[PDB]
């Protein structure tokens, strides 16, 4: 179906596949932004299989891109959990003496494609959570132990011993570096900007856990997580398993809280 979808979109203004369209109480659908034709190329979703991404020029023309996802995730529940996080966010808006500070939230509402199918919509501007300066550690470290060597150390003892884990962490100590700052370094040169960004992002990453252990939802997996390079602040989405159901894994979630030690190192 090369031509048919693009042809159909032009004649009738299709409701947006990705729509942050908070319609009115009347709810009428008259002048929502409309896109006629698809883009030239559809980038694959970063994953096991190539899931496509859809983008086009808007009615106003402002970019509104998205990326569909392969697999069979059951995220209607995740949709509800996101809605719950959102209601909690409104609650965060509801408290004066907290009213002044912004409340940390960035929804990811993409309806599932089917019972075993999904279509996702990437946040407009974003980055993989650690990707920003992820490799700058090599820039940060002219000399460093291999991350593969670190994985070897991790797998050296899947069995737990009091001495073994401590010795492994001792090995981690000399090799690792407190180098988590650079991605947060070159953001903006404006005067109040740095003081603006850091407290914001810290409060953000805190609000994650702040809703978290209450929900007990998400293991902050690096691929799973999201960090907002453009924002000068952080936001994550796409959590999948929840309710402290750590028992499913061979090890339950050894996560008292979000181990944002690296972002902490962005100490100012």
């Amino acid at each position: 179906g090369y031509k048919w979808f693009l042809k159909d979109a032009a004649n009738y203004g299709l409701p947006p596949i990705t729509m942050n369209v908070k319609v009115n109480d009347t709810g009428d659908y008259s002048n929502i932004p409309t896109v006629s034709s698809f883009d030239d190329t559809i980038h694959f979703a970063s994953g096991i299989n190539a899931p496509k991404v859809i983008t086009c020029l808007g009615s106003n023309g402002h970019t509104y891109k998205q990326l569909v996802k392969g697999g069979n995730d059951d995220l209607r529940q995740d949709a509800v959990m996101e809605q719950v996080f959102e209601q909690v966010n409104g609650f965060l808006r509801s408290y004066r003496k907290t009213s002044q500070r912004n409340l940390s939230m960035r929804t990811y509402k993409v309806i599932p494609l089917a019972l075993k199918t999904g279509v996702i919509e990437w946040v407009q501007d974003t980055i993989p959570l650690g990707e920003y300066l992820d490799s700058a550690h090599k820039v940060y470290h002219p000399k460093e132990w291999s991350l593969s060597t670190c994985r070897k150390l991790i797998a050296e003892k899947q069995m737990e011993d009091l001495e073994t884990r401590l010795k492994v962490y001792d090995l981690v100590c000399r090799h690792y570096r407190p180098v988590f700052r650079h991605f947060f370094l070159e953001s903006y040169a404006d005067p109040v900007q740095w003081f603006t960004t850091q407290t914001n992002y810290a409060r953000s990453t805190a609000v994650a856990s702040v809703l978290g252990h209450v929900l007990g939802l998400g293991d902050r997996h690096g691929q799973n997580i999201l960090i907002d390079k453009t924002s000068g602040e952080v936001i994550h989405i796409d959590l999948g398993i929840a309710f402290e159901q750590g028992k499913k894994l061979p090890v339950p979630e050894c996560v008292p809280f979000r181990l944002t030690r690296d972002v902490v190192d962005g100490m100012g």
Partner: peptide, 14 residues
């Protein structure tokens, strides 16, 4: 003025 000190402390920290 508060503008200069903030990220500057971190820069010196590096």
């Amino acid at each position: 003025l508060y503008e200069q000190s903030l990220l500057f402390l971190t820069i010196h920290n590096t």
